[PDB]
């Protein structure tokens, strides 16, 4: 019984030294959190219908009244990108709990 336990604990070390994907449940959670943050950073490249994605260029090129209509379009879509991220993370937090 002792030699069989000692040999079965040997096979855990050999497998964890040999196979790649066995911790796929833990790597999938790290990958989902990283992919959700990369998706959130990438939504800053979106115009949401404004003349530019770049908030400084709207302010470099347009006056106070023209810029407000363009900035509202970026606020609307970036605020929607955060509400989507936080809802998806609230739904994932329940799976982890």
């Amino acid at each position: 019984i002792a030699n069989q336990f000692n040999s079965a604990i040997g096979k855990i070390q050999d497998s964890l030294s040999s196979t790649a994907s066995a911790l796929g449940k833990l790597q999938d959670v790290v990958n989902q959190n990283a992919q959700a943050l990369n998706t959130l950073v990438k939504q800053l490249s979106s115009n949401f219908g404004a003349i530019s994605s770049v908030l400084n260029d709207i302010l470099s090129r347009l006056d106070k009244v023209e810029a407000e209509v363009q900035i509202d379009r970026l606020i609307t879509g970036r605020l929607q990108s955060l509400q989507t991220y936080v809802t998806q993370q609230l739904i994932r937090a329940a799976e982890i709990r």
Partner: protein, 49 residues
């Protein structure tokens, strides 16, 4: 399992220059997104275990 940020300080000199090209974590932090560290360190989880 390889982590993407543990939360353990970014001090600008480790994130400016070459790293400001070749790292996603600096593009996240320069856009207002931050990882927070866990309360128990991995060394405290190992003491419990």
């Amino acid at each position: 399992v390889t982590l993407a940020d543990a939360g353990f300080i970014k001090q600008y000199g480790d994130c400016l220059g070459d790293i400001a090209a070749r790292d996603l974590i600096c593009a996240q932090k320069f856009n207002g997104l931050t990882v927070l560290p866990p309360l128990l360190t991995d060394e405290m989880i190992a003491q419990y275990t």
